[PDB]
Amino acid sequence: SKISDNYSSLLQVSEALGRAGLESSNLIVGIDFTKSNEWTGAKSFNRKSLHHLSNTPNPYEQAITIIGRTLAAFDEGNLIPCYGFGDASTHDQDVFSFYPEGRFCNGFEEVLARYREIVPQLKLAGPTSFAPIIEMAMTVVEQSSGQYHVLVIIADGQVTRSVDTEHGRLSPQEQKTVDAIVKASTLPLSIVLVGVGDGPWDMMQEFDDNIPARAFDNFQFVNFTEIMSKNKDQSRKETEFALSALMEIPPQYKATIELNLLGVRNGNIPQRIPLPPPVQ
Ligand SMILES: [Ca+2]
Ligand SMILES: [Ca+2]
Ligand SMILES: [Ca+2]
Ligand SMILES: [Mg+2]
């Protein structure tokens, strides 16, 4: 079924996870390095690229930071695989790992630093598909033999489509991404989409709420730019991000149990190999 917002506070989600008996989880990070990032900051980031580095934090950095402050507990070893995608070296075909021989990030401090070290060495390209980052997360979950993971994707949300067409028919990047979201539901994987820039967000909301062919609701959408733009403290913006990020975790974790996915190896998950980072 489709999972509504069933928690109105951060504490409520805590308690549901407590009743759910969650003992173990890990995180995987995916970052959109597609070229749309250069204009999806028109309204929300002062006509600067969403990946532009300067004296002020860009929205990817804010997301990397807020994520580190709020969601940290959900990676049991503070060791996080990270992956870029959409850059010139992977296009809509591959991902690349943040580090040469697979090595993971030591906490989100490193994710922020490694992100800073990397993004201006990149050619932002495309097209935009989520199929490779999601298939990479699948391989990850499959190799740990069914250990529960949450995939956090930070992206401007503009998966490649055509403007008109209004067909309601899917581009190749739309079909491969949807086919991935459906395939991922045969594994203990939660997907969390952290959306930055101006949007529009109608596709991300479709991924969140309306993907009939999947076995359970495995996708959540977070409008980061909405949460940040609001009228309140920095504290309460972080609580709000965390509630939004975690809103579907308890149902989805229970689904991985009731659908027999947790700790179960699927056996039909193709082994995706990440590319090394295209950097120095
Ligand atoms: Ca981990
Ligand atoms: Ca959902
Ligand atoms: Ca939702
Ligand atoms: Mg794009």
UniProtKB/Swiss-Prot annotation:
VWFA domain span: 26-246
PTM section of the record: N-myristoylated.
Membrane topology reported for the UniProt record: Lipid-anchor
Cellular localization per UniProt: Cell membrane; Nucleus
Record-level GO BP terms: abscisic acid-activated signaling pathway; negative regulation of response to water deprivation; positive regulation of abscisic acid-activated signaling pathway; protein K63-linked ubiquitination
EC numbers, comma separated: 2.3.2.27
Task performed by this protein: E3 ubiquitin-protein ligase that mediates the formation of 'Lys-63'-linked ubiquitin chains. Regulates apical dominance by acting on the auxin transport proteins abundance. Together with RGLG5, mediates the ubiquitination and subsequent proteasomal degradation of the target protein PP2CA. Functions as a positive regulator of abscisic acid (ABA) signaling through ABA-dependent degradation of PP2CA, a major inhibitor of ABA signaling. Acts as a negative regulator of drought stress response.
Assembly, per entry: Interacts with the heterodimer UBC35/UEV1B. Interacts with ERF053. Interacts with PP2CA.
Entry GO CC: nucleus; plasma membrane
Principal localisation: membrane
One GO MF term attached to the UniProt entry: zinc ion binding
Keyword Cell membrane included in the entry's annotation: yes
Reactions this protein catalyses: S-ubiquitinyl-[E2 ubiquitin-conjugating enzyme]-L-cysteine + [acceptor protein]-L-lysine = [E2 ubiquitin-conjugating enzyme]-L-cysteine + N(6)-ubiquitinyl-[acceptor protein]-L-lysine
Coiled-coil residue windows: none
Stated name of the protein: E3 ubiquitin-protein ligase RGLG1
Organism: Arabidopsis thaliana
Free-text tissue specificity from the UniProt record: Ubiquitously expressed.
Keywords noted in UniProt: Abscisic acid signaling pathway, Cell membrane, Lipoprotein, Membrane, Metal-binding, Myristate, Nucleus, Stress response, Transferase, Ubl conjugation pathway, Zinc, Zinc-finger
Observed effect of gene inactivation: No visible phenotype; due to the redundancy with RGLG2. Rglg1 and rglg2 double mutants show a complete loss of apical dominance. The double mutant seedlings rglg1 and rglg2 exhibit a dehydration-tolerant phenotype.
Domain of life (superkingdom): Eukaryota
